[PDB]
Amino acid sequence: AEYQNIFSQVQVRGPADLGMTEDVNLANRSGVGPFSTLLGWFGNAQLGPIYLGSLGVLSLFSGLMWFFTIGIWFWYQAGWNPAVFLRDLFFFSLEPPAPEYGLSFAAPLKEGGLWLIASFFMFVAVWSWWGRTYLRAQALGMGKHTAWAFLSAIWLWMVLGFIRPILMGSWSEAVPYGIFSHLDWTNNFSLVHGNLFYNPFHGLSIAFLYGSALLFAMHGATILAVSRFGGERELEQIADRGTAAERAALFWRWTMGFNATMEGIHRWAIWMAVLVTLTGGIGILLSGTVVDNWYVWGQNHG
Amino acid sequence: DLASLAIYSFWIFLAGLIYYLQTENMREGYPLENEDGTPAANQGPFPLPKPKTFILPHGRGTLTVPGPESEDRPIALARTAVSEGFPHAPTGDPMKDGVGPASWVARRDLPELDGHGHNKIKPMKAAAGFHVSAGKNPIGLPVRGCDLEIAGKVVDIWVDIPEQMARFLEVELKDGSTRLLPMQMVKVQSNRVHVNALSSDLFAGIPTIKSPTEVTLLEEDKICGYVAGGLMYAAPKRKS
Amino acid sequence: ALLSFERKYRVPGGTLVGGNLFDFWVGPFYVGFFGVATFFFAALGIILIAWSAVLQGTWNPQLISVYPPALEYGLGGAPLAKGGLWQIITICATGAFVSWALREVEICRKLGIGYHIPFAFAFAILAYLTLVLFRPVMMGAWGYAFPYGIWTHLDWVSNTGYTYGNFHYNPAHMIAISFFFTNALALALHGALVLSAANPEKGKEMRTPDHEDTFFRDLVGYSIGTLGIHRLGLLLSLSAVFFSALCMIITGTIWFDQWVDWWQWWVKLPWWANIPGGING
Numbered sequence A: 001a002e003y004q005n006i007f008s009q010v011q012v013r014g015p016a017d018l019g020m021t022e023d024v025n026l027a028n029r030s031g032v033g034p035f036s037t038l039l040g041w042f043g044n045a046q047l048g049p050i051y052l053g054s055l056g057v058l059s060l061f062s063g064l065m066w067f068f069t070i071g072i073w074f075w076y077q078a079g080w081n082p083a084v085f086l087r088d089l090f091f092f093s094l095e096p097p098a099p100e101y102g103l104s105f106a107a108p109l110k111e112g113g114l115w116l117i118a119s120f121f122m123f124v125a126v127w128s129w130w131g132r133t134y135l136r137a138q139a140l141g142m143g144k145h146t147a148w149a150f151l152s153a154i155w156l157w158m159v160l161g162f163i164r165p166i167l168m169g170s171w172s173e174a175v176p177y178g179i180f181s182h183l184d185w186t187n188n189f190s191l192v193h194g195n196l197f198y199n200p201f202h203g204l205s206i207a208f209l210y211g212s213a214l215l216f217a218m219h220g221a222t223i224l225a226v227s228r229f230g231g232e233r234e235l236e237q238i239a240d241r242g243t244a245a246e247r248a249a250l251f252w253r254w255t256m257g258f259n260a261t262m263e264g265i266h267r268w269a270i271w272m273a274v275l276v277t278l279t280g281g282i283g284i285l286l287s288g289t290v291v292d293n294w295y296v297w298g299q300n301h302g
Numbered sequence B: 001d002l003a004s005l006a007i008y009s010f011w012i013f014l015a016g017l018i019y020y021l022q023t024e025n026m027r028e029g030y031p032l033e034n035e036d037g038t039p040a041a042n043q044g045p046f047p048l049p050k051p052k053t054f055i056l057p058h059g060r061g062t063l064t065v066p067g068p069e070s071e072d073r074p075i076a077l078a079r080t081a082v083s084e085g086f087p088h089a090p091t092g093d094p095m096k097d098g099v100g101p102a103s104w105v106a107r108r109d110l111p112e113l114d115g116h117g118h119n120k121i122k123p124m125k126a127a128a129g130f131h132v133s134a135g136k137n138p139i140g141l142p143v144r145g146c147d148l149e150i151a152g153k154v155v156d157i158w159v160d161i162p163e164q165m166a167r168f169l170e171v172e173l174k175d176g177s178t179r180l181l182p183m184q185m186v187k188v189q190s191n192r193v194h195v196n197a198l199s200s201d202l203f204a205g206i207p208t209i210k211s212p213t214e215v216t217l218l219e220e221d222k223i224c225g226y227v228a229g230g231l232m233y234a235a236p237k238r239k240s
Numbered sequence C: 001a002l003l004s005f006e007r008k009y010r011v012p013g014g015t016l017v018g019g020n021l022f023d024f025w026v027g028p029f030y031v032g033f034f035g036v037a038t039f040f041f042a043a044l045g046i047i048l049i050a051w052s053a054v055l056q057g058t059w060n061p062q063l064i065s066v067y068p069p070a071l072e073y074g075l076g077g078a079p080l081a082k083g084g085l086w087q088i089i090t091i092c093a094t095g096a097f098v099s100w101a102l103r104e105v106e107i108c109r110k111l112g113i114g115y116h117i118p119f120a121f122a123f124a125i126l127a128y129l130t131l132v133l134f135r136p137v138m139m140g141a142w143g144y145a146f147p148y149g150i151w152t153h154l155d156w157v158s159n160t161g162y163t164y165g166n167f168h169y170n171p172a173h174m175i176a177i178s179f180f181f182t183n184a185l186a187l188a189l190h191g192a193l194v195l196s197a198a199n200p201e202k203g204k205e206m207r208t209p210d211h212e213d214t215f216f217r218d219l220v221g222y223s224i225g226t227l228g229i230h231r232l233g234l235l236l237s238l239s240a241v242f243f244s245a246l247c248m249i250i251t252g253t254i255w256f257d258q259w260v261d262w263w264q265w266w267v268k269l270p271w272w273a274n275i276p277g278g279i280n281g
Ligand code: BCL
Pocket: A089, A157, A160, A175, A179, A180, A182, A183, A186, C168, C173, C174, C175, C177, C178, C179, C181, C182, C185
C-alpha cells in the first residue's frame, strides 16, 4: 500500500555521533553506548553519550537514595519475604508523619521520619536535575525553554509535597510514596474538598491535558503528512519556508480558518502542555487553604 | 476572595496569551491577499507582530519576519469564475509548471548544512562509513511506477549525516541520468521498489540537480513537489 | 482571503464526491460535499439542541442539558421530550464528525499530503462513539451514555466512575493516564527544544538539529530525533485515547464490580496467596 512513515523501512548507520561542542566540557561526556536496531525503526538507534557532571552525579545519587529509602521500607513491610514483596508491591506505602507532628521533624523513622528523609532526597534530586536542564542549554548556547517549561511541572510537584503542607501547618497533608496509596490520596483529596470537578482551575487543567493530546495528535500527524517535503526538518523550514510548511498551514486554514507557522506551532505546543501543571498547581494550592469545598465556593464564588 | 480573584486574573492572562500566540503565528503568509496579489481589505482583528531576526549559522545571513512577501516565481494558473473563492485551473502541464499538489517553493538554492557547516545530505558513496544497518537494502532494486512498468534502478541512498537517516533514493533511468525520489514516497519490497505517485513515463520529468553530490533546498522542493503531484496528475495512467 | 503563498494550491480536484460541484472555498474554509454534509448535520444538531433547551426552560448554556433515554427504553426509540432529541442529535453529531473527517481527506487530496490527520481524528470519533454507541449497545440501553450539557456530563463521569469504586483501579484507565501524562511531557519538551534552538541566547546564531540531539543526549543519554518525536507525540496521543476507549468498553460489560477488587487475581495467585505478612496476609 502507500507507505506512512510511522516506521522506517531502511536503516542507515554511520560513525557514532559524539555531537556538538560549544562550551561543553568534553571531559564529562561519557562514550557513546550501544546502537539499537529496535529503536531505529522508530527514532534514533544511537544511545549516548550522556554528559555526567557534578549535578548529574548529585541528582542520580539522591534519586537512588530516595528510591531505596522507599524500597527498604517496602521490604520491611513485606517482613523481608520476597514472595510477599512481589505480591503486595502496590499495597505498600511510605506514609508521612501524622497530623500531630505538624511541620516538625520530631517523629520516629517509622511513622513519618523515613517519609521526610525520602522527601528531602527527592527535593535535591529534582532541583539539581532542574539546574542540569538549564546548564546543558547554556553550554550549547541554546534557549532556556526546556528549563522554564520543566519549572511548570516542578510547580505542581512542589505545591503537592512542600508548599501546601507548609501552608496547612502539617506534613501529613503530603502525598505518600506508594502506587495504590497515592491514587487513594488523590481520590480522598477530591472527596474531602467538595469534589474537584468544581474547582475551576482543575477543569482548566483538564482542557490543557486533553488539549495537549489533541494538539500533539494534530501536529505529529501534520508533520508526518508533510514528511514527503522534508517537514520534520522544522528548524530549516523556519529559516527558509518550503512547501511542507505551506501545505501544513493550508491544510489547517482550509479546515478551520486559521493556522500556524513552523515556529509558532511550537509556541502553541509548549504553552498548551505547560498550562496543565500551571493551572493545576493553583487549583491544588488554593484547596484547604482558601477554599474548603469547591462545590460551596462554586455556589457563590466567595 | 483570593480564589475567585485568581480565576479572574487567569482568564485575562489567557486572552493575552492567545493574542500573543496568534500574532506570533502571523510572521509568514501575511498580510492576507486577494486572488490577484493585492493586499486584502479585512485582515482580521490581529495586527502583525514587530519583526524578529534569526541569525542563520554559516555566514548564511539573516531572516527578518515579517517582511516583504513575494513568491519570487511564475504561477501558471487562471481563474475559472468571475468572483472569489473558486479553483484556479492550471494553464499548462501542472506537474511541469509546479502548481497544485505539484507545487514547490523558491527556497535557497544551497544545500541544508549540518552543525559543522558540511552538507547535511549526501549520497552514501560520499558519506564516510555509512551503510544500511537494518531492512532491505534498496540499492540495486528496479523501480516500478504505478503503470506497473520499470522506470529504472536504484543506485544509491542519499542520507542525512547528522540524523543518520535515508532521505532519498537516487535512480538511474534508461538513458543513464539520475533522479532523487523521496524515501517517504516509495515502497521498498523484497524484489522491487514501487512508486505509486508516478508512472514510468513521468520519471524523466522529475527535476534534476545541478551537481551530483549535493542537493539544494530549491531542488528538494522541486523534486518532492513533483512526485507528490503525481498522485493527482498521473491518475488515468495508474491501474489496479 | 488568501495567505500570500496560497493561490498556487487552490487548484481544482481532490474531491471524493460530486466532482466539481462543491469544489470551492468560503473565505479561508474549503467546502466540498462533506463541507455541505457537516454544515447540514451541525445545523440540525444545534436546532434540535436549541429546541431541547426550550422544553427544559433555560437559554443558559451552563444549564442546558440533553439526556439520553431512561434505561427502561433499552435500545428502542424514545419520545423527543425524553431521549428522542438526544438519539437524533447523536446521529447528527456522528454525521458531523465523520463528514469533517472525510472533508479533511478531501483537503489532503487537493494538497497532495498524507492522510495522517483524518486518521488521527478517527480515534477521537471512535472514543466518542464508544461512550454513546458501542458501550450503550453492549449494555442494552442508551441511558448509559453521557448527557450533552457542560456540567451534567461531568456528573455522568463522576457517577459512572463511582459506580465502580475509585475508578483509578481500572487497569486500562491507568495505561490511558500514563499516556496522557507522558504525551504532555513530550509536548512540553518538543516545543521547548525547537524553540530553544530557533531562539538561542541573545546575539547567537540559530542552532541545529545536531544541537537538538546533542542537548538531549547530554541530558538523558538518548535523543529520538526529529522524525522520531513526531512519530512519538502521534503515538502517545492516539494510545492515550485508544486505551480510554478500551477502559470504558470493558466497564459495564466484561467488568461491572468494584475495580479495586479486580487486583485480587494477582494477590491470590496460589504460590504466594496464603503466605502471612505484608498488607494482604
Ligand atoms: C496528579 C495527581 C496525583 C497523581 C495521580 C495519578 C493517577 C490517577 C495515576 C497516576 C499514575 C502514575 N503516577 Mg501519580 N499522581 C501524582 C504525582 C506523581 C508523582 C510525583 C513525584 O509527583 C510521580 C512520580 C507519580 C508516579 C506515577 C506513575 C507510577 C504512574 C504513571 C506516571 C506517568 O505516566 O509518568 C510520566 C512518564 C514517565 C516516563 C516519567 C517516569 C515514569 C515512572 C513510572 C515514574 C514512577 C516510577 C516510580 C518512581 C517507581 C515505581 C515502583 C516500581 C514499579 C516497583 N505520580 C499526583 C499526586 N498518578 C498512573 C498509574 O498507573 O498509577 C498506578 C495513574 O493512573
